[PDB]
């Protein structure tokens, strides 16, 4: 009923990456939705969208997210994940960065990414939509098949959580004791994101290469109530999972491995999908051949230094376009 959407975002050259050649190793054509990689031999790939090195945060938000936010408001469950090599900009894409000197408010920070922009817009849209709504958020991270809660205000970050099958959703799990924070208005957004980032820093001191090996799952749930013309009360639940995956180059890698095998199983129509075999694929079962509208943002480098991982990423992402989901609205 609906293919997983796959898009590619190339970042600029970083301070490490040498460009020797007059014509780009990696060419992005947003109009033709093509990425072309000089391995004079060039492999070309078509995707649903393509964003070259110059693409700004606001452009990614407008092109990818705005349409997905509308699906969320219709009561679809939606998932956007960032996939790619460490250093290519998964976190830059999904979260962004904070500009220094407080030269900008968080709402106008041009380095801000999907999560802060999305949260701001939810309030803008639903307030002048007139509708009765509440928003709650959670931030869960997975490292070494263990579950870290970054929004719990009270506990040590080293107090890890447990997962169990949802009696109310054949393809879902409940994270027991996961902190779910009600965001009453947009002026409560920043302090939440701040607490999440700070607590992550604490996690990074406890675990080897935490940034690059961890998966980050930021969940926003919107309860919306509507009156029908026949005078009945309609409750819709829209859900957005914004997922920043472990670096593609990587028990430490069980979740990333199993995601691989799950994707392979779905595209090759093999009959057993091993969702159950890692924490990430249990949490995202529904995003991967289930009842969710899913997008992948594949992040890549333009540089010869990182060409092999860039090629693996493109091939991995490109195959995922064949995954068929069956989107359904929550009333």
Ligand X SMILES: Nc1ncnc2c1ncn2[C@@H]1O[C@H](COP(=O)(O)OP(=O)(O)O)[C@@H](O)[C@H]1O
Please choose which of ligand X, ligand 4C5, Mg ion, none residue 75 contacts, taking the beta carbon within 5 to 8 angstroms, the exact cut-off set by kind: none
Is 285 labeled as ligand-binding? no
3 state DSSP class of 234: strand
Determine contact, residues 135/220, Cβ cutoff 8 Å: yes
The C-alpha atoms of residue 287 and residue 273 are separated, in whole angstroms, by 13
Min. distance of Cβ 83 from Mg ion in angstroms? 11
Please choose which of Mg ion, ligand X, ligand 4C5, none residue 87 contacts, taking the beta carbon within 5 to 8 angstroms, the exact cut-off set by kind: ligand X
Residue 313 makes CB contacts below 8 A (sequence gap 6+) with 83, 84, 85, 88, 248, 298, 299, 300
Please choose which of ligand X, Mg ion, ligand 4C5, none residue 89 contacts, taking the beta carbon within 5 to 8 angstroms, the exact cut-off set by kind: ligand X
Residue 215 interacting with ligand X (CB under 6 A): no
The C-alpha atoms of residue 109 and residue 89 are separated, in whole angstroms, by 17
Residue 91 interacting with ligand X (CB under 6 A): yes
Determine contact, residues 86/247, Cβ cutoff 8 Å: yes
Is 85 labeled as ligand-binding? yes
Task: Write the DSSP string, 30-96.
Answer: TTTTEEEEE---EEEEE-SEEE-TT--HHHHIIIIIHHHHHHHHTTBEEEEEEEE-TTSSHHHHHTB
Residue 106 interacting with ligand 4C5 (CB under 6 A): yes
The residue range among 10-18, 191-199, 305-313, 315-323 that interacts with ligand X, by the rule CB under 6 A, is 10-18
Min. distance of Cβ 64 from ligand X in angstroms? 13
Tell which residue, 105, 30, 97, 96, has the closest CA to residue 61: 96
> What is the CA 95 to chain-centroid distance, rounded?
9
Compare residues 181 and 288 and give the one whose CB is closer to ligand 4C5.
Answer: 181
Is 91 labeled as ligand-binding? yes
Compare residues 12 and 153 and give the one whose CB is closer to ligand X.
Answer: 12
Please choose which of ligand X, Mg ion, ligand 4C5, none residue 286 contacts, taking the beta carbon within 5 to 8 angstroms, the exact cut-off set by kind: none
Work out whether strand 132-143 and strand 181-183 pair parallel, antiparallel, or are unpaired: antiparallel
> What is the CA 228 to chain-centroid distance, rounded?
33
Min. distance of Cβ 84 from ligand X in angstroms? 6
Compare residues 91 and 287 and give the one whose CB is closer to Mg ion.
Answer: 91
Residue 285 interacting with ligand X (CB under 6 A): no
Compare residues 93 and 287 and give the one whose CB is closer to ligand X.
Answer: 93
Residue 109 interacting with ligand 4C5 (CB under 6 A): yes
Tell which residue, 24, 25, 28, has the closest CA to residue 9: 28
Residue 87 interacting with ligand X (CB under 6 A): yes
Q: Where are the beta strands (DSSP E) in 146-281?
A: 146-149, 162-165, 173-176, 181-183, 215-227, 233-244
Please choose which of Mg ion, ligand X, ligand 4C5, none residue 133 contacts, taking the beta carbon within 5 to 8 angstroms, the exact cut-off set by kind: none
Contact residues for Mg ion, defined by CB under 5 A = 90-91
How large is the angle between the packed helices 114-127 and 189-206, nearest 10 degrees?
Answer: 160
Of residues 293-322, those binding ligand X (CB under 6 A): 299
CA angle 95, 323, 272 (to 5 degrees): 110
Of residues 208-247, those binding ligand 4C5 (CB under 6 A): 218
Compare residues 215 and 291 and give the one whose CB is closer to ligand X.
Answer: 215
Residue 60 interacting with ligand 4C5 (CB under 6 A): no
Q: What share of the chain is helix, strand, coil (3-state, %, to 5)?
A: 30, 30, 40
Positions touching ligand 4C5 (CB under 6 A) are: 91, 95-98, 106, 109, 112, 115-116, 139, 193-194, 196-197, 218
Positions touching ligand X (CB under 6 A) are: 11-12, 14, 84, 86-92, 97, 247, 299
The binding site for ATP comprises 84-91
């Amino acid at each position: 009923m609906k293919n997983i959407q796959v898009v590619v975002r190339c970042r600029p050259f970083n301070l490490a990456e040498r460009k020797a050649s007059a014509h780009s190793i990696v060419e992005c054509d947003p109009v033709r939705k093509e990425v072309s990689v000089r391995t004079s031999s060039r492999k070309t790939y078509t995707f649903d969208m393509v964003f070259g090195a110059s693409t700004k945060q606001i452009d990614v938000y407008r092109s990818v997210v705005c349409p997905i936010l509308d699906e969320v408001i219709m009561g679809y469950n939606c998932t956007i994940f960032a996939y790619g090599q460490t250093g290519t900009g998964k976190t830059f894409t999904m979260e962004g960065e904070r500009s220094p000197n407080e030269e900008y408010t968080w709402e106008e920070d041009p380095l801000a990414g999907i999560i802060p922009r999305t949260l701001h817009q939810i309030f803008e849209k639903l307030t002048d939509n007139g509708t009765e709504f509440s928003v709650k958020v959670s931030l869960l991270e997975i490292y070494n098949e263990e579950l870290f809660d970054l929004l719990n205000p009270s506990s040590d970050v080293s107090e890890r959580l447990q997962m169990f099958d949802d009696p109310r959703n054949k393809r879902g799990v409940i994270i027991k004791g996961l902190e779910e924070i009600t965001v009453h208005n947009k002026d409560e957004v920043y302090q939440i994101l701040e607490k999440g980032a700070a607590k992550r820093t604490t996690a990074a001191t406890l675990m080897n290469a935490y940034s690059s090996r961890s998966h980050s799952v930021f969940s926003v749930t919107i309860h919306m109530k509507e009156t029908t013309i026949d005078g009945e009360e309609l409750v819709k639940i829209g859900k957005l999972n914004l997922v920043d995956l472990a670096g593609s180059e990587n028990n430490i890698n069980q979740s990333l491995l199993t995601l691989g095998r799950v994707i392979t199983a779905l595209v090759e129509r093999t009959p057993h999908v091993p969702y159950r075999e890692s924490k990430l694929t249990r949490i995202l079962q529904d995003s991967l051949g289930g009842r969710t509208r899913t997008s992948i943002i594949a992040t890549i480098s333009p540089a010869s230094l990182n060409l092999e991982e860039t090629l693996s990423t493109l091939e991995y992402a490109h195959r995922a376009k064949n995954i068929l989901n069956k989107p359904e609205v929550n009333q």
